[PDB]
Design an enzyme around this catalytic site. Structure first.
Site, PDB file in Angstrom:
ATOM      1  CG  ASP A 248       8.779  31.420  46.933  1.00  0.00           C
ATOM      2  OD1 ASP A 248       9.736  31.045  47.656  1.00  0.00           O
ATOM      3  OD2 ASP A 248       8.890  31.612  45.693  1.00  0.00           O
TER       4      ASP A 248
ATOM      5  CG  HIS B 166      20.539  32.461  51.343  1.00  0.00           C
ATOM      6  ND1 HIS B 166      19.641  33.025  52.227  1.00  0.00           N
ATOM      7  CD2 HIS B 166      20.515  31.128  51.586  1.00  0.00           C
ATOM      8  CE1 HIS B 166      19.083  32.072  52.952  1.00  0.00           C
ATOM      9  NE2 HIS B 166      19.597  30.911  52.585  1.00  0.00           N
TER      10      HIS B 166
HETATM   11  O1  LIG Z   1      27.152  32.193  48.625  1.00  0.00           O
HETATM   12  C1  LIG Z   1      26.989  33.201  49.292  1.00  0.00           C
HETATM   13  N1  LIG Z   1      27.311  34.498  48.787  1.00  0.00           N
HETATM   14  C2  LIG Z   1      27.826  34.729  47.411  1.00  0.00           C
HETATM   15  C3  LIG Z   1      29.298  34.804  47.300  1.00  0.00           C
HETATM   16  O2  LIG Z   1      29.873  33.565  47.662  1.00  0.00           O
HETATM   17  C4  LIG Z   1      29.695  35.208  45.916  1.00  0.00           C
HETATM   18  O3  LIG Z   1      31.103  35.238  45.748  1.00  0.00           O
HETATM   19  C5  LIG Z   1      29.065  36.546  45.535  1.00  0.00           C
HETATM   20  C6  LIG Z   1      29.272  36.893  44.118  1.00  0.00           C
HETATM   21  O4  LIG Z   1      28.524  36.151  43.199  1.00  0.00           O
HETATM   22  O5  LIG Z   1      27.658  36.562  45.734  1.00  0.00           O
HETATM   23  C7  LIG Z   1      27.160  35.997  47.048  1.00  0.00           C
HETATM   24  O6  LIG Z   1      25.811  35.843  47.092  1.00  0.00           O
HETATM   25  C8  LIG Z   1      26.455  33.125  50.718  1.00  0.00           C
HETATM   26  F1  LIG Z   1      26.936  32.052  51.270  1.00  0.00           F
HETATM   27  F2  LIG Z   1      26.865  34.225  51.375  1.00  0.00           F
HETATM   28  F3  LIG Z   1      25.066  33.083  50.695  1.00  0.00           F
END
Ligand SMILES: O=C(N[C@@H]1[C@@H](O)[C@H](O)[C@@H](CO)O[C@H]1O)C(F)(F)F
Ligand SMILES: O=C(N[C@@H]1[C@@H](O)[C@H](O)[C@@H](CO)O[C@H]1O)C(F)(F)F
Lengths: 334, 339
Positions: free
Chosen positions: B256, B185
């Site tokens: 942004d 995110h």
């Molecule tokens: O997708 C999201 N979080 C992801 C995880 O899914 C991922 O396994 C990890 C490793 O790359 O990094 C996060 O940012 C969220 F939904 F929490 F924003």
């Protein structure tokens, strides 16, 4: 070959082959594992060379992970079976029923894990257990389904498939990222009872059935705690450890000063902190780093080690049954 | 009722009704508009009361916007038609053809905009013009289609529907968010492609929508290193050289979400890069810090760029239209696409 315990930091690397600077960073006792991304992938043979040189640096060998969920979250494309988004499995559930959907999920898990196991990868950070409430774009089609029962059952079926391919599972994003909007630090205003009746159930069920790890949601649930889950003793110690009985790894999710951010993560109940895309912050964190006392860390890392030997994987991939699985999964993706 | 030009800051509010501190904040000449979120919505009548009191503070009335795309991006649910994800329109394109898909897009736009116009909203931040390259989960089903021609044509059809409902359009996320991976995110993704590659595909819907009167753009929080080392929302090359000069876009460029280095400095570099209006969400403290001693950058086009976005339908006229059978049929059609 130095013998150093796996540290509590999972870091990453810049490109296709280790630089000398990266080798030195990865020998730091603070580090216990590595997460790979698309920028680290050229082809299968290069990947094998990369994972081998990572593993050669030290013992116990650094645990190597990747985000292979399916659909728009699949880092390594060329030479891999293209994986369907997890919501495709939930669509099968709705159209053809649970039995056909579970069978399909097992095959997806098997193909996903086996092909990665052949390349020296230990674990994929999957499955997403978040419910599709129709609210959260950043989850989106990464969720199996709206319905907790469907999510739980599809996840269990995927998990069995992953285990066949040598891999444990990592449930995401505890205690449930599905309800918030995400397109910032989101707020999920629901009560614990509401979460227990839905979003938490797949986590409970997966934990009971041997899930190795969890990634926490970067989300605040104010009716339970004012802190985001990944920084909350209530969520991680009181609810996840004590109430649910989970014994696996709790990852911190992305911390990217850093020392203080890591400290509060560990204090909240995380075993291992992730620091991605920022080798500078890894360098800052590890310098004068004191490894927090965690007698369970070594076993928690080791449970995630891939359970298939290289030869055993090559043999399984030659079988007709596996090749059929490959073509079935490929067909779901197109 | 004070007469103050609309300032270059778009701020937001905490809950369902304005507090006294919010009223004072919204009277600041730095502020020109407000974005609403789900936390500002209880029901339609409360929403109407909220927008009315926002508008009553000053003239020209503060512009009010919301993210109503469809699918998993729709802030206000109860009492609204549930909107389909934009990729549903691309699926109709593939299955029933362009003509049926364009017609459907027109109705979705009409319903989307009309229901919001009834509540005193000026604009929805839609459509997404990003291409579905199959890489970016955060966009996901928010993209109409993989194919730039389909995206452009569906977007144009949606835009005509929006206008029927009183609204202009805001294309997202310039110059194209579709190709990067995005499933964290809070990272800054990198799109390694060349400008020519973007011109052949991701940029084309933006060019076409600009030509056809698109009112605004939201930039991608993405770095395209072959063009500039800066993310698009902070790049003179993207915003002045490419979007203004080369494409000829005359509408609003939003920043942004600026939420340290400090908010004043972050706003400064946004304006300097070519943004007309800066967004500062979820942080009234930072809006207060920004506006205190704020010098409004010289922008002779600002007033007209805000005004172009004002809703074109009066409140009574919209209540009348929504009682019609034609509009109620549109509602049921769009509802059906969502289920
Ligand atoms: O997708 C999201 N979080 C992801 C995880 O899914 C991922 O396994 C990890 C490793 O790359 O990094 C996060 O940012 C969220 F939904 F929490 F924003
Ligand atoms: O969803 C994304 N960006 C969203 C916009 O769509 C939205 O209009 C704006 C206002 O709330 O804020 C961004 O965070 C992206 F795809 F760029 F990640």
């Amino acid at each position: 070959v130095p013998h150093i315990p796996r540290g509590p930091v999972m870091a990453d690397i810049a490109a296709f082959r280790l630089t000398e600077e990266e080798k030195q960073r990865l020998l730091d006792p603070a580090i216990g594992g590595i997460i790979l991304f698309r920028r680290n992938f050229q082809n299968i043979e290069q990947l094998k060379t990369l994972t081998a040189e990572i593993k050669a640096l030290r013992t116990p060998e650094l645990i190597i992970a990747v985000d292979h969920e399916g659909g728009r979250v699949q880092r390594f494309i060329e030479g891999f079976t293209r994986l369907p988004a997890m919501n495709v499995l939930g669509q099968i559930w709705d159209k053809d029923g649970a039995s056909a959907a579970e069978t399909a999920a097992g095959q997806v898990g098997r193909v996903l894990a086996t092909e990665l196991s052949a390349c020296g990868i230990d674990l994929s950070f999957t499955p997403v257990l978040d419910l599709d409430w129709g609210n959260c774009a950043v989850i989106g089609n990464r969720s199996f389904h709206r319905n907790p029962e469907a999510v739980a059952r599809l996840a269990l079926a995927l998990q069995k498939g992953l285990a066949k391919g040598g891999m444990k599972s990592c449930g995401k994003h505890f205690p449930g990222h599905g309800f918030v909007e995400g397109d910032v630090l989101p707020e999920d205003g629901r009560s614990l009872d509401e979460l227990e009746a839905a979003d938490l159930a797949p986590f409970r069920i997966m934990s009971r059935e041997g899930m190795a790890a969890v990634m926490p949601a970067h989300v605040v649930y104010p009716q339970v705690d004012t802190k985001p889950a990944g920084f909350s003793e209530i969520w991680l110690k009181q609810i996840l450890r004590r109430d649910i009985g989970f014994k696996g790894v709790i990852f911190s999710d992305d911390l990217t000063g850093i020392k203080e951010r890591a400290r509060i993560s560990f204090e909240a109940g995380c075993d291992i902190v992730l620091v991605c895309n920022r080798p500078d912050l890894v360098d800052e964190l590890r310098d004068g780093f004191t490894i927090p006392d965690n007698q369970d860390l070594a076993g928690r890392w080791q449970y995630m080690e891939n359970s298939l030997g290289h030869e055993a994987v090559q043999a399984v991939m030659q079988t007709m049954g596996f090749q059929a699985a490959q073509a079935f999964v490929a067909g779901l993706a197109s």
